[PDB]
Structures are given as structure tokens and as C-alpha cells.
Symmetry: D2
Subunit: 292 residues, 4 copies
């Protein structure tokens, strides 16, 4: 499933920074009960940067085992070297994931033609649906609508997570792709706007702690009930902003701990513990959302 | 060693995309003959992003072997996970490198406290000198002067490669650190200005192809002869700009090939071959510098 | 009238840079026949910068006389000194204009509180409806949604022309103002998106040469027929971009000459004649729109 | 005359918002005693935006009268319409000013060809020396080095106030102009760096309140004594930053009042009185500089 509220799920850790199976179970149960459409496993919010390929595959496989067929799982699979992306994708072929979320190469700043060759090569070598991921503020490069148009002609490139926050991208892309290509926001604060312009859903950080409200917001949006959706969005807006008051996923992991969804808020370096001022901002946002 | 013209050396490849030992030897001999001060091996221009850690280590070790003590070698050792950076650095402990060039984590956008903890942990697990490297256009992170001050207190953090192109940073950093902390430019087009303000050298892309001119420019600067240095700078300014007409190191590899310094201009995806227009542009820049 | 397609009309000039009454008549007749909602007289596109207060008032009065009750006229009235804005507004009180379009002070970069006092003072001293105008790329300051919310409580501050091109502003403002407050795009390339998010119309440059299509696009948008509107917008998109290929209103005046709507494309310094390359780009855009 | 520390002098006002002659005399005497090189009258810091042209001229003429030949006076003379700039400049022909400071047109965002034609027309209608002034954060326009080169060929265009804060511009401009073209900083916080790179002085906000320190800093720079100059710079760096904690000249007027240099800190809307927090911040900066 590639529409609606999709959670960019945390990778909960114990105090030593190893994956906490019990906490992950609790989250997956929460998303199944709360109507989340799908789970993105080991994306950005899942600390893809700091897990190696083996830990990464283990978390995706644990997620699939715990989901037990009840919710679809999408794996984070991007890399900044095309061979590495291909490699990582092969590990998931026939795993039971429904698709991959693959970020533009970071740090090396490829050209548009380089992005086109990168994602074309990845798609060629799997039968899994690929969702492109554009987030220039993190990567240093910006996959432009013209190149998305080119890539959308590849049979298994099926959509994009557009995290620029630049809402003009929705209809720039839409006009260049077919009606079945999925447009997903990657920017929780602008996501409702993104859906109102023609987007199909959101791959969300806020959904980690407000799963039911996110799922209902996205359904109302899909039905065209934007005024109703916006009431929900206004209650969630402080979270949409304050989950980034310190680097993601520092705030959202602390929030999940505060709600009791995970045992510890531990992260791996270079992520560091939430500051006291951040705890206060985040808990105020949680209370605005009605969650505490 | 950590002053003057330091080349950010290309990792020359064969047509298959693997290191070309004959080409590497030819470059290293060229830098020895030309008066280059040091070699940074497998930094950004060396394709750090697309070599695996074994491949990376092999290139460093080969470079050291071929240098044969004639020219000091600094290894690129950054990572966006602190554990990974510590592992990569440990590969080189007792190798013969003189220090490490370690980039701010990319993609995961840590806080300044995160950057402090990351670089301090790395510095604690080695005796090698550490050069911090700040290049926010690539990483999504900006290591601010205040934080560089805090880190400069760690015994083996000894300098910074400042690749913002923002020349105010020179004296902002200089006032927070001791007189022996080295300030190196990471932006060829502003590097002579950077030295004019107090910087000690440059880790240079241009020096791949204008090694003697860059070493002479930097000597003239260190001696206070800025007008004479500027004449050299003006001859090189089109290369300083046009070696980034397509993503680095696409242009500089082509230029190396055109000058007969390497056998092929092959790179790894997502870097792609230079365009025809790019070739013309770089060729004009080489003609301007008097190299072709 | 403060909804639909509102034209930011050129001030047509003869070869000496004086207002050409015959050309202005022709434009006004064109807008009446083409279903334009209202005319903004001596706004940015009308060369407010280069007319003095007397020429400015004369053009607004000539526009009103030529309109002859058939189309509403809004006057550009902004200034960067609050006393000057008040002064200029008084000249129009009881002129027959329906409202004023008042830009944030330019060059002096006032605070939000300064913007609040500026526009509050202007509104206090007239009974005319005021439409606020935010265009940071020109002024150096950005009237933020919180301040718009404060100002919208003033009885005669009735709407905003939002020219940031940042579409998140639509619902940030909407949630802070009453349902009768008018939200108007000032960015033709994003205007349809702006209306789809809840905006009420556009104060448009493109409407100078595509009045009928703009009027129909905005009506379809108001009715919620966004797919139908978007077909029109895609035919107009090259104009929406290429009317800014050189500084506005250089392209649109040349376009109006090419269509025969005005006798000359003359402007006042520091605007200079369209380049040959600009003529070619603009005429290609006109042909894409079906206008030539 | 056009080197060293040039003060961008405040236009001190009474409580009604009109020029305070006693205050103006007190400032001018202060600059004479302090070793300030020249006075820019009714530039940006002098509230050019909120004085009418008669008021502006009166302030210039009063300043000249009070200077009584003891200190040279440069008039602010910019406008965003070329005709208006020519008129304002003509008011001062034979006045006794030594030159004019003329800003790039603001708001109307002319092209580089437009900027060339605007400044060349102005220079053609006077015998007075013209200092170009580039401050894109205020104007929406950036006068690039190439264009400054073209303009430097006009006999009476003799320098530039470069207020981008982008220090690469120093040597970019210097290489395109003759040795007698004057380069002045318009950014106090980077001005010592700007002089280190080859600039000839600063048109300074800080010099309103630290005139002797700024003149001594600039003398030390001209002589090549940068380390000694930097000590002065470090003492002043909090003022250089915090005189813009609220929009200029809000902080610097308050500071002048607090030091007893002017009778009131009144400004004209849309500038508003300093906030309490701003007062505390500026006061701390004055204490750091040793002035309070
Ligand atoms: K990693
Ligand atoms: K497809
Ligand atoms: K990699
Ligand atoms: K140290
Ligand atoms: K004007
Ligand atoms: K109102
Ligand atoms: K004014
Ligand atoms: K000249």
C-alpha cells in the first residue's frame, strides 16, 4: 500500500543502541490498530545512517515478522553509490516487503543525468516497486520534476516521497507522470497542503505518535474533505514543527518514550540525547495534540 | 605536511571502475616533482562516496607505498555514523599516514553538540592528527566556529578544511583557537583570499592539474607576496570555477586524462561521463592556465 | 471586486515615457470585454517606481475615466514611509477607486511591529478597503502570517496579495483571519496552486495579454474544477515564467506591443528595452498560449 | 575623504520626528574630535527612506554648515527612478559636498544593463564623484563585479560601498578596476576582513558610537597592522552585530541617546522604538566596547 498515512517508523533501541524487539512489537501493534497504511522500515527516522547493512536487514526482517501480514512494510534502501544501492536492494528481493524507499544520493551531488542512471539501474535489477525520495536539505541535491518524469516511465518506479516542502512540485510532477504514479509528502508540516494539491499521502514522522489522527486526516483529504482534515492538522501542527526542534529522530524517539510506546529514547551517535528545553517544547506539542 | 598546496587527489580508474596503479603512480610522481605539500587520499575528489571501506583502504595503502616517503599522505576518514568513522580511522593507525581528513556527518544533520561528540570520540580512538572538514553544500550540516573552538581543545584535532566559501569564517575560527591550529581552504576559487586573511593553505581540486602553479601561489602567499600570487590565481580562476561545471570529480578526471596524467577518465555511478559541452568548457580553462 | 482574475495593468507609454491615453483605453476595453474582475492601476507592473505622485494620480484618474464604471479600479498606494503612504492614500479618497493595494515598506526593512503600525496607520486614515502586498524578493522584508492575522482585525484591511510563491502561506494566513478576508496570489506561476489551496484569485501580470483565459481559469478554480483550470494553466505556464525573463514589466510591455494592444513598449529607466533573446523567448510563450 | 572610517551618520530627531540641530552639531563635533574621515549624510542609517527630498536636502545642507570645513561630507543621493536620482543629485551640485553615495535602485529589480544605464546617466549629469552602493538584502538587486568594472570606466564613478558581506567581492572588483577606485565596506562585522583583503575603508554604522576606535582600527589596517586592528575589532564585534538586533537605525539611535550624543532616539514610522530586550542587548554591547 502506497497511499494514506505511512509511518517513517523509529528503530527503537535499548541503552546500548541495539534494536529493542519488544518496543518494536508494541509500535507495530499500535500502527495496525490505528489504521496506518504502511510502515517504512529503516528510513531516515529509523536511523538508516547509523545502522550497518546487516543491522538494517535485521530490523526490516524483524518488522516483517512482527507485522505478520497485518500491515505492509516498505524498506529504506537508498545509497550514495549506485552499486551499493543495488546490493542492498537484492537483500530484500523476496523478503515480503512491498517496496523500497530510495533516496537521491547524498554528499556527492550527482547531476540530473546521474540521478536518472542511478535510479534506472536500481529499478532494473529488482522486481520491487521503488519510491524515489527527494530531500535536498539533507543530501545536497535536488531531483527535479523533469527527471522524475523520465524515471516514472520505468515500469517499477512507482512514486516519489517529496520532502522539499516546496508545494509547487506537486503539480509540476503530476503533469509529467501517469495517474497511477504516487505522490507522497515527506514534510509533515506541509503534508495536508500537499494532498490538497493532488498528493496521495504522506510518509510521516508525526504518525509515530499520532497514528490515528494522521490516518483519519489522510482519509478525509483523499475524500476531498479538506476543511475537516484541516481541523486535525491544526491540532497536530505544533508536533509537525517541534518533532524537528532538534535533529530527527531525537524528538520523536523521546515522544515515543513519554507515551510509553518504547522502553528507551536511546539513539546512536552522532545523534545525542534531547535537551531539557526540547523535552519541554515536545511535551507541549504532545499536549496540544491531545496525546498526553 | 599541513600547510601550502595539498592536493585532493583523484582516484584514477580503469574502464571497469577500479584503481589504476600506473595512473596513481604517475600522479604521485607529478606531485613530488611539482612541489605539492601533501596528498589527501580518498577525500571527496577521490570518490570516497563510491569506494567501499576495503577499496578505500587499498587506495590509501597504495598511495603511501607509491609515495615512498617523498610526500606526506592524509587519508579521508569521515563517516556519518561515529562508530563507522572510528572503524575507518582504526584501519590507518600505524599505516604511515600523517593525519586524517574527517568530514562532518552527512545526511543525518546532527546538532553542534552531536558534531562535538562525534569528532571528540573519533579523536579519542586514534593518535593520528585530525583535520575537520566542513562542507555544508554537500552534507546538510554546518560546523560553526564556536564548535571548532571547542574541538580545537582536543589534543589531536589540529586543523580544519573550510569549504563554505564564506571568508568570514577565517578570523572567526582563528580567534577561538591557538596559533598552531591550521586553517585550510576547501574552495579553490576563494583560497588565495582565504590565505590573505590568515589561512595556511588549501586542499585543492585545481592542484590535480596545475600542481606547480598552486604550490608557487601558496608559497607566494605564505611569504606575503599577494600581488604576485594573484597573477597566478587569475590564470587559474577559470579552472577553479570550471572544474565544477559538472559534479566534482567529473571535470578534473577528464582534465587529468587530457593532460596525459591518467589513462582513463572513468568514474563510478552516480557520477557520469563529462558532457561534450563540459569538455569544451574545461579545455578552454586548461588553455587559459597555459597547460594545454 | 477582490476575487477572480485581477490585472496588474501596464502603464503604456509613448516614446518619451509619457502615459499613452489611446493605448490605455484599448487595454481597458480589452479587460472589460475579456471578463477581468478588476484593474490594479500603477502597481509594480504599472511602473509605480518611476512615476512621481502626480503622474501616478493622473494615470489612476485616467483609468477610472476610461473604465467609466464598467470595471472596478484598485490603486497602487504603497510607500516605504508611513506618512507618504497616508498622504498618497488621501489623494484617492472619493476618487471612485474601490480599494488600495499597499506594499510592505521596501529598502528599510521594518520589524513585524513596524509593519503592523505602518498598515494600521494607513487604514485608520481612509475609509477605502486596503489589500496588503507582500513581495520579499523586491522589498527585503516579509510580512508574516501572524502579523497578517493582527492586521486583518482592522475593519478596512480586507485582504492580501501574497507574492512569495510560498504556498504554505495560504493556510497559515487563512487559519488566522476571518472567512471574508481575501487571499490573492501575486505569483502567476503558482497562482492556480494558490487558489486550489483556498485562495480567492490572483493579481496577475499574465492577465495583461491572456485576460480571457485567466478569467476562465480563475472561475473554474473558484468552482472547484481544478483539472479543467489546470489545462488552461499549462497552456499559460510558459508565459507565467517568461514574462519574468527580464525584469517586469519589460517582457509584458513588449508582449502587449506585439499583440497590438499598446502603441509602444517604452519604459522608464532603470528599466531598459527587451533584449533580442528575450523577444524570442516571450514570443514563443505567446504562441504556446495561442495568442499569436 | 574616501578612505578610513566614514560614518553613516544618524539624522537625530526631536520628539516630533524632525531634525535636531543641537544633536547634529554635537555628533559632527564628536566625529571631528574622534578622527572620523568623512560623514555620509542621509544614507540608509540617516533615514533616507523616510525624509522627503526637501527634508533630505535640508539635513545635508545643515550638516555641511555645521561641519564648517572641518570634515568632508558625502550626500546620500540614490533613487529607484533614474530621473529622480538625477534630480536629487542636482540639488547638491555646488553645495560643498565632496561626493555622492548612490544606491542601486530598490524594489524594481533592474537588470545589470539597467544598473549600468542608471548610474551612467546619473554620473553624466554631475561633476561630483559617485560612490556606488550595493546592498541586495535591502534592494532586491545585486550589482555584480562585472558591471562595477564597466561603470568604473566612467570618469566620476570612483568607488563602491559593498555591503553584501561577501568578501570575495573585494578582489573580484579590484581586478576589474584601476588602482585609484576605492573599495569601501558596508558591513561593519566584516569590514576589518574587507580591508585585509585590499579594501580602503568602511562606511560604518558602528562609528556613530565608537568613532575613535573605528578610526584607530582603520588607520592600523591601512598601515598593515592587522593583529593590533583585530584587538579593536574584537572589542567592537558585539556592537557590529547588535546594532542590527532590531532594524537599523533603531539600535544605533538608542545607543547615541544613551551615550549623551543626541537628545532623543525618535525615528519615523515604519521604524519603531527599541524594545526592552533590544535596549539590554545594545547596552551589553556598549559595555563590552568600553563605552559605557
Ligand atoms: K552510514
Ligand atoms: K512507472
Ligand atoms: K557510500
Ligand atoms: K588541538
Ligand atoms: K520612486
Ligand atoms: K478586516
Ligand atoms: K520614501
Ligand atoms: K572612474
Amino acid at each position: 500500500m502506497f497511499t494514506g498515512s505511512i509511518v517513517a517508523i523509529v528503530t527503537p533501541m535499548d541503552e546500548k543502541g541495539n534494536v529493542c524487539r519488544a518496543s518494536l512489537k508494541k509500535l507495530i501493534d499500535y500502527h495496525v490498530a490505528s489504521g496506518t497504511s504502511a510502515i517504512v522500515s529503516v528510513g531516515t527516522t529509523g536511523e538508516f545512517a547509523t545502522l550497518n547493512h546487516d543491522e538494517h536487514a535485521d530490523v526490516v526482517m524483524m518488522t516483517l515478522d512482527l507485522a505478520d501480514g497485518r500491515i505492509p512494510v516498505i524498506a529504506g534502501t537508498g545509497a550514495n553509490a549506485t552499486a551499493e544501492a543495488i546490493s542492498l536492494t537484492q537483500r530484500f528481493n523476496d523478503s515480503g516487503i512491498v517496496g523500497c524507499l530510495t533516496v537521491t544520493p547524498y554528499y556527492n551531488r550527482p547531476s540530473q543525468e546521474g540521478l536518472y542512471q542511478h535510479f534506472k539501474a536500481i529499478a532494473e535489477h529488482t522486481d520491487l516497486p521503488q519510491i524515489l525520495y527527494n530531500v535536498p536539505s539533507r543530501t545536497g541535491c535536488d531531483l527535479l520534476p523533469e527527471t522524475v518524469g523520465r524515471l516514472a516511465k520505468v515500469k517499477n518506479i512507482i512514486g516519489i516521497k517529496e520532502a522539499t516542502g516546496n508545494l509547487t512540485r506537486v503539480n509540476q510532477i503530476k503533469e509529467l507522470v501517469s495517474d497511477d504514479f504516487v505522490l507522497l509528502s515527506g514534510d509533515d508540516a506541509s503534508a495536508l497542503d500537499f494532498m490538497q494539491l493532488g498528493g496521495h499521502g504522506v510518509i510521516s514522522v508525526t504518525a509515530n505518535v499520532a497514528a490515528r489522527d494522521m490516518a483519519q486526516m489522510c482519509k478525509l483529504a483523499a475524500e476531498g474533505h479538506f476543511a475537516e482534515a484541516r481541523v486535525i492538522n491544526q491540532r497536530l501542527m505544533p508536533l509537525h514543527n517541534k518533532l524537528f526542534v532538534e535533529p530527527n529522530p531525537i524528538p520523536v524517539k523521546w515522544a515515543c518514550k513519554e507515551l510509553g510506546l518504547v522502553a528507551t529514547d536511546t539513539l546512536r551517535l552522532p545523534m545525542t540525547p534531547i535537551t531539557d528545553s526540547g523535552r519541554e517544547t515536545v511535551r507541549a506539542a504532545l499536549k496540544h495534540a491531545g496525546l498526553l
